[PDB]
Amino acid sequence: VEKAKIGLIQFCLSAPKTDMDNQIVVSDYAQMDRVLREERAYILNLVKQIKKTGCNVLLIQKSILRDALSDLALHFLNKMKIMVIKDIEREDIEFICKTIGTKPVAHIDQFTADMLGSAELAEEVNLNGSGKLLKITGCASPGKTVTIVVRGSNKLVIEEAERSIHDALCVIRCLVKKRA
Amino acid sequence: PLSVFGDRSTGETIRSQNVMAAASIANIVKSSLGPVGLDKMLVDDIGDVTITNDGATILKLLEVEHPAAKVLCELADLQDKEVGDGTTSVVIIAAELLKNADELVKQKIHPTSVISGYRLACKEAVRYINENLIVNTDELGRDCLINAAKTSMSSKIIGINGDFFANMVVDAVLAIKYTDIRGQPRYPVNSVNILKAHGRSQMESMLISGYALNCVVGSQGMPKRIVNAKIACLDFSLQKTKMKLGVQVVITDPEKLDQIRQRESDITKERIQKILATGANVILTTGGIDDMCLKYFVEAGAMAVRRVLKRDLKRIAKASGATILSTLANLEGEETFEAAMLGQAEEVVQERICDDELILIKNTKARTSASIILRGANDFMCDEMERSLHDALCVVKRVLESKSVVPGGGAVEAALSIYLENYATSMGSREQLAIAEFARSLLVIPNTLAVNAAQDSTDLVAKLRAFHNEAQVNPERKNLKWIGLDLSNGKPRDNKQAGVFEPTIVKVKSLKFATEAAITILRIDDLIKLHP
Amino acid sequence: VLVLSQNTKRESGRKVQSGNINAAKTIADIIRTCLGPKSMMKMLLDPMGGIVMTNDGNAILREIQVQHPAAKSMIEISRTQDEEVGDGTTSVIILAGEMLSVAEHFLEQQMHPTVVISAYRKALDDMISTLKKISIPVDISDSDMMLNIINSSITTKAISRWSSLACNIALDAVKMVQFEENGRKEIDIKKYARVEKIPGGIIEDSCVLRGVMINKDVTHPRMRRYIKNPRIVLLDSSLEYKKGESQTDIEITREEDFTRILQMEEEYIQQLCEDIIQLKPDVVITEKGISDLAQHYLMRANITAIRRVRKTDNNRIARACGARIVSRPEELREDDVGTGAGLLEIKKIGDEYFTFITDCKDPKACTILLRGASKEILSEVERNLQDAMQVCRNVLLDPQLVPGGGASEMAVAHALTEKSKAMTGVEQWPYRAVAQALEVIPRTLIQNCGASTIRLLTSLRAKHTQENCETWGVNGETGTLVDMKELGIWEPLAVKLQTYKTAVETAVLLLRIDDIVSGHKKK
Ligand SMILES: Nc1ncnc2c1ncn2[C@@H]1O[C@H](COP(=O)(O)OP(=O)(O)O)[C@@H](O)[C@H]1O
Ligand SMILES: Nc1ncnc2c1ncn2[C@@H]1O[C@H](COP(=O)(O)OP(=O)(O)O)[C@@H](O)[C@H]1O
Ligand SMILES: [Mg+2]
């Protein structure tokens, strides 16, 4: 993806479920098809409202009470050429908001185009044989955060390198705080 | 004193134990190095036999309980996962380097100087490897890949019959080449179907031009030979419709229950009629298909395959140019099926191969696929052939990606040892002995190759060293560096024109990994084990 | 205590090789008893509590529990050879044992196994070339030649006194199973030839039928049991009122709701029955269960119904008549009705009702009716018939013939001996040893016959030394040399080629082991 717009989503994209006990009573032969047609129309309207803002990289948070993304919404987003990354925890929200500079959105009525973050490169990399990795480089309004990738042959060597890096960072912090 | 409640060791006790463990690990896998060594055999506790000699599998299936051996095991696993070839040589080199550094440590020498000397020697060997490089595209090209595949398949069960297997691997690699940014030649592996079926021998294992499926037909009334068919990729269950958990049915009028029950079965029929409205023949489904839905495909004269894997369906859709549709929904509010996203196969013939049957698919019009059906004797021979084929494919991929070849054998190690010996005269500090130990550790591959061949080792090593010393000095004899090692008779020959061919990405990575392992293990001198 | 591995045992190479060779020799000496027409039958005792009395070389091997990896590999290759062609289960084991025995002599002479495997492959290539060169064609239209081939192939089993009819039965079964559906692919899957075993009667009453046999009975005694030319229909759904699957609830508040539902159920049942009757059926073959209202509605129109049938039985019925199994009663149409039935009689075979459907026009699925004494004899007869059918299928698939007995082996040995005179190096001794090892089949046949190994062996060698005697074999009934052109013993070439390839592959796999590491508790 080239020149993408990252967007944070804090709501699910599945069947509408209320906070109370809801149920659908079917008594006619056409209601079984009418319910599915209305659900498909609602999903299409949600996809069109998401696509109208011009987003490219969608970030959906983790949900345990209900499904955050169904198969129909995923297929529609794939047909609309939109990358979906449905794997965001609830602890790294502030770090992402400070790094990419994107305000969290929890309702489709406030998902305005100006609440998105401008990105210059949103691509993924593949190693020789140890899983995939996602990297985001290029931001219009960067923050004061950074990340360091530690490699190595064994996990013990990686842990030792991480401990050495942490010790060096603590030493630099102490030297800056003491100014002596 | 010191309330620890556990066994501890301080001094030369833990170092000697680690040295003995490394020596035992090296000697365990020292009977399958080179094309002269035989295979191994691993039996569990229930009677299952496993015959392999790749190196990583032997270390994985051995139940290792020592940390010093677990480090070598995980290092070999990482080496096999990275490149794919050279899993035992790196472990042997690391064990020899550890044994050589133990003697220096026991000689009242600080391990820091030894580690620095080993790092300097590794850097010098890495810088010297790039000097001796041969471009594969500057010579013949086609005759080098065959030699590389024959060398990679020289220490396996198909050592004699390696001429046809090399050509088959080359053809599979040429047919599996994908198209991307058209900047670098990418050759992805793990994309062919390797089926293991007993019956015929090894010469009757031809290469199938297309993708193969390990599934049978659904109903017996469906045909098994359709010429010029259309492949339909689906990703949904083709059974009866069922409501969700939050949607119940409260019958209040008896004049509608029969209509609802009829519509529950007519919806699937209408969906099948809308799917088959474009004239589809080959229908692939990942989920299960009910018995009522198969009657429509039987009466329409089409094929319906169920229980299809996701990777196989993805590869079929990529080769045939189709698109896996998870649902029939589009940009509106009606389920419609178009004919623009359908396959176009040549001929689908379900041939019977030893009792069980399998569906064969030839090449299409978008891309070209390939599949190799290896035929062995029992079950261990098929697994060994599959492992050898995977190793050959990985070696060919690494060779095509590196665009360079290095004559393997007992030549590169001897040249590196000579270069390190000639470089130790410049380092006048305490790192002079470390470079010598690093150079002597690299000479353990020809020693093991001569020991496995049951021939003279000292005389051959001396002859190789003299030849390398004569080829180093005097620029008039610079063509003697490609001697290699011929274990068939016990005399040097030409290892560059028609001998051993190996890529350059295997030696450098293995040497760096062995050096890193030796460095991270040599810095251990205190073991503390707590009581469970 | 610091240890590297717990509960692990490692051996050397020479000891492991000697143990594997001894195990292979023991297996070959145990299996060499069942060979030739003068062999004896064996019986096993399975842990279930039965008796397995047969004479096949693979059935005795599958009922023996071993612990050596070499024995397991031998059992595996024997089972693969049996699943491939069906014939030559003992010959491959004997050949592998003889190859191991003649290779241990060179292995004891500090010789590397790489050259041994190379010589074995070079000899296998020449053996395959010679067997393809000495091939003899045969026509597929001559029924007498096929009958003689089947009789010579099954002359070893106990059916040597009844193969006069078993050969014709197997030929008819092979001719009926062969069917070409769509395209140009002639399949020959042996799944529509159900071989039923019924105790009692004489062995002469066993004859093939032009149809199928269902061990069931009618649902009502008022139905017909003997129809001339009926219209047998097939179904796959249930003819009863069952529940749904979307979790539906019925909330009633009036009075006539229960009666209305009970009447609607009967109305739907009657509508389904009329939809079945509208096509004018006769014999209903359904896989589900039928209640009482549908049975009464079918009896009102004089329609027969059969309950509880298997899927394979339904497929055989559909292939015999010519109809198809349809699960939609509303869309049965006319083309899905089979009219190939010509007889439907239900008799009693010892307090048991059996449905017989024969007198078909052009049936494609036959049912072999076996009548014997107990169960072991019936199982042996079924196994012999299956082996004969597999041999006939392999012959029809590849019209090639080679001289049976020990003529082809001696010819190949003489060819390899004459070809080894132009070789040099150290590859001539194994090339001659593998040629001299091919005489293990005629030697065993002579030992089982007249026990004159040396004399008959040197006589056959002197006979085959000539340049015009390549079909001279050894008779397994008398003990004298007789040409195969006047006897009538022939074997398929593909079976011998597969046996040779399997033996060579097993020898190669066994001649490359030098370490046994056992004790890791799997994974
Ligand atoms: N045909 C051959 N001639 C000479 N040396 C060979 C030949 N094949 C392999 N070797 C050598 O044997 C060594 C071991 O290779 P191999 O046993 O295939 O497994 P690995 O490469 O993983 O150690 C290699 O370093 C190679 O140089
Ligand atoms: N009547 C016979 N005349 C000549 N050779 C025979 C006769 N019967 C059996 N043989 C030989 O004995 C060998 C063993 O045959 P058999 O025991 O029936 O099956 P298998 O080949 O599976 O052991 C065959 O290769 C065949 O050539
Ligand atoms: Mg290798």
Ligand SMILES: [Mg+2]
């Ligand atoms: Mg037989």
